[model samples]
Target: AQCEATIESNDAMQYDLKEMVVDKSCKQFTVHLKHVGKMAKSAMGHNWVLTKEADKEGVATDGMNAGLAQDYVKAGDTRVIAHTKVIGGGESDSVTFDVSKLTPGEAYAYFCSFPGHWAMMKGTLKLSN
Candidate 1:
């Protein structure tokens, strides 16, 4: 928890960030997901899923069928290098993935795979030098 940043979400199904550029100095990156409202995961849940820009639909579609038991993401999905469990009101989850999974020229996409939340809850991630 010491090497992480806290990002917030609400019942509005929106994240505070549209894009995030991690400090390249970090050998590892951590995303702290917080749902600071009064709703349940079945209604307004949120999570963070990271993958390549070109692989979004594939992961998202499979994630949809995975159901909440799998946090809406496919079990052992190789497409996702990292993710957090789906969370709701006053809940928090975190995921720490190696920065090595990122590349300078690549633009990664981060999204929430809680049912239909993906369309509204998504962001861009870049690995800068």
Candidate 2:
């Protein structure tokens, strides 16, 4: 069965989705990110990172320091479940992770790790029926 979903990002510091659901049947899940804006990565880059809702800020903070070359994500960070590389306007990236990383009834957070983008460009993901 297919096991993936997509989200869109534009220049307005926004993501078209605020939440996503992972089906219980899939052993793995993938997130496809698309940037529909017209800005450069240095100016409006976006990447998708996933973690526990509580860890969002900490991850984003450390990722900001990790810089663009690292896709704004700390290398080998255990807290991150999965993530896509930073993409600019008209670009896209995809990341897949084992569904076991998600917990039923628990909330997970997904967001862009680009500097200053996390706060507004974030969403929740969950394991669902």
Candidate 3:
């Protein structure tokens, strides 16, 4: 069972992956994010953030409010299951989380929390048997 996945982000505001699945046999899951575009963090920063499908919008909004210094994620936001730090071109980041935090049958959402990036850089995640 695959316990990790890699996603690529570009200056075009897109993620290479639109969906991901975590094998149930895995006790933990990790996500590796790579910035493939030659852009500066201030102009086109990207990070991977996970939350319940229903919480995506709110989390993103508050994250934007939190500003870039916080990696575009609200400090201590319970709704965020896991997240990677923001990075620019030629850089990468990763996050690992216990699988127990995810519900097998529940819908999960992942996105880049860079202000205005969420709309195009979002994807779905699920636990699979």
Candidate 4:
């Protein structure tokens, strides 16, 4: 299942799915975001961000400072492997990342770096068996 995964986001700052799988055959994959809420982006925006487990906090911190219009992500960050644009209720965004960037067993985590979303919207990502 390392090929692709569809993840969801909503007004409550929740991701519909936590665990994602990537097929070993893929050299890259995509994260499809679905926001099923009814609120506006200003009220409850969400995004997907990928980084090393240890770098998650720092990336998220700088992302928050980057603000909503910037998709809550740092501009031109090398540590961030990939990310999607921020979305509001009923909106969507997706990101395709190179599989080569991931190591066999390095720790990776995905989170929404919105001002207050990371705490509840974070989860682990990895190349699985």
Q: Which lDDT value does model 4 have at 73?
A: 86
Model 1 has an lDDT value of: 0.87
Q: Indicate which candidate wins on lDDT.
A: 3
The C-alpha local distance difference test score for the whole of candidate 2 amounts to: 0.93
* Candidate models: Cα lDDT each: 0.87, 0.93, 0.94, 0.85
Candidate 1 lDDT over residue span 11-83, tens digit each: 9989998887877788899999999889988988888999998888889899999998899999999999899
- The collision pairs in model 2 are none
* Shift in Å, residue 16, candidate 2: 0.2
- Per-model TM-score, in order, reads 0.93, 0.97, 0.97, 0.94
Error of 2 at 57 (Å): 0.4
Residue range 1-129, candidate 3, lDDT tens digits: 289999999989999999999999999899999999999999999999999989999999999999988999999999999999989998999899999999888879999999999999999999988
For candidate 2, write residues 1-129 as lDDT tens digits.
278999999999999999998998989898899999999999999999999999999999999999999999999988999999999999998888999888898999999999999989999999989
Weakest ten-residue segment in model 3 by summed lDDT: 1-10
Q: Give the residue spans of candidate 3 off by over 4 A.
A: none
